[PDB]
Amino acid sequence: KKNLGRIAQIIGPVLDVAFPPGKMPNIYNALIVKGRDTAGQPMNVTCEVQQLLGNNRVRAVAMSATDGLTRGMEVIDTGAPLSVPVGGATLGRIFNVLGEPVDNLGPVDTRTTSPIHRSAPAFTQLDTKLSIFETGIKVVDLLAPYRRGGKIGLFGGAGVGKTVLIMELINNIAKAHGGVSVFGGVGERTREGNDLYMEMKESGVINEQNIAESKVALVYGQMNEPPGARMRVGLTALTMAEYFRDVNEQDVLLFIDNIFRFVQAGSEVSALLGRMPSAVGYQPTLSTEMGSLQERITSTKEGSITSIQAVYVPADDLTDPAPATTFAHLDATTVLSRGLAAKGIYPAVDPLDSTSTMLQPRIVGEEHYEIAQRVKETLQRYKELQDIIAILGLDELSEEDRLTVARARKIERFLSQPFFVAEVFTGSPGKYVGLAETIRGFQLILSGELDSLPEQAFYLVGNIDEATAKAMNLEMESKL
C-alpha cells in the first residue's frame, strides 16, 4: 500500500510492473490500476501479482481487459490478497470475481469480508461422515451413489448432458436442502447462466422480492472474461462457501461448472508467465494447483460441503491430463458417454465407467449392492458380447446368451429418465424416481418376470409401473 508502481510491459493479459526498491508486493497480493478508459474517467483494472521477477519489477495478471492500459500507468498495492465479501449479504446477488454485484441491484455490506487465498483444513478437522443421499435420477441413485459432503465430478464431453444434469440436480437438491447453496460459474455460456438465473427467479429460491431470504449466491466468471476472472472465480465461490461452513456451521452446496475452464485459464495465462510447457499444453503447475483449489472443498466438523462439479473432458478422452488430475480429488465420479448420448439414452451416464465409493455392503445396504453389481455384471457381459454378435449374427447364440442380450437391452433403456429441466428437449412431463422404485424395477427386470414387455417400453419411464403401462400402450396401439 501507499507506493506508486508503474507499468513496464503489457504482453496482452500479463503485465510487468515496477516499484520503488523500498516496498514490493507479496505473492498473490492485489494490485489495482488507477488507469483511464476511452472516455477519460478513472477506471480500475484489478490485478494479482503472481511472480517476483527481480530488478524491482514484478509480474501481474489482469483480472479485466487490457485494452486502454498504457506503459506509464500508476498502480496501488493493496497490501492484501483479493478480499471478497461474505455473510448474509452474499445471498441472492450475482457476483463477479471482484466481489462486485453484477445484477442491477445496490451494493453489498462490506464490513465482513474474507481473502481469497487460504489453506485447506488440518487433518484433524475432517468429518468422516459417509451418509448416502437419494438424488432421484435412477442411475445416479442406484449405480453410483453420491457421498454427502464429499466432492462429486460430472465428467463429460461437450453437449452430452453435464449442464442439464447439474441444473436438474439443483432443481432436485436445493429445495430439499437444509442450508445455503452457492453457484460458481467458471467459463460457461452467458445466456445459459442467465437461463439459470431466470429459471431460479421463477423457482422462488431467489425470492427476489425480499433479499437475504434467498438460498443461493451466484458467482459467474464466464467465457467472455480475461483469464484472471476465470482463474479466480472458483476461488471466490469457494471462499464464500467456506465462510458459510466455518462461521455459520451449516451444510452448504457448491456447484462448480466448468472446472476445465479454470484449468484452461491457468494454462492460457501460464504459457506467458515464462513457464516451460508441460504435457500437451497445460501448465507445469497443474496438480498442486488443483490440490490448492480442491482440497479446501471438504467436509469438516462444522458443516459439510457436497460439491457437484461439472468437469469437461476434451475430445472425450479421459486420458487427458486435466481429467487425469481431476479424477483424484473426487469421490463419487460419473462418466457421461457419447455412445449413450447419440444412442438416445439420456442421461448419457456410462454405467460401466461411472463408479463411486459409496456403493458398499456396509454403506448402502445389501440388496442395493448386490443388485447394482449384478446390473454392472450383465451390462459388462453385453458389451463383451457386442463385437461377437456384430459379425456372427443373432441366431447363433445360446438361450442364456440371447436372454442376456435382451435383458441388457431392456436395462439400458430403463436407465433413461425424462428430467425436469429437459422437458424442452424430450417432450414429456418431468419425472422423479425414488431409490425404492429403482431397486424394485431392477429386481423385476433381472429376475425374469418382464421379458414379455417391449424393449421400447422402458424408454423414458419413471417407475416400473410406468414401464408396464407404457408397454400396454404400445401393444394396444399396435393391435389397434
Partner: peptide
C-alpha cells in the same frame, strides 16, 4: 481417443 479406439478395433 484415437489410440484408444484403434486399440479397441485391434481387440
Amino acid at each position: 481417443a484415437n489410440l484408444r479406439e484403434l486399440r479397441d478395433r485391434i481387440g
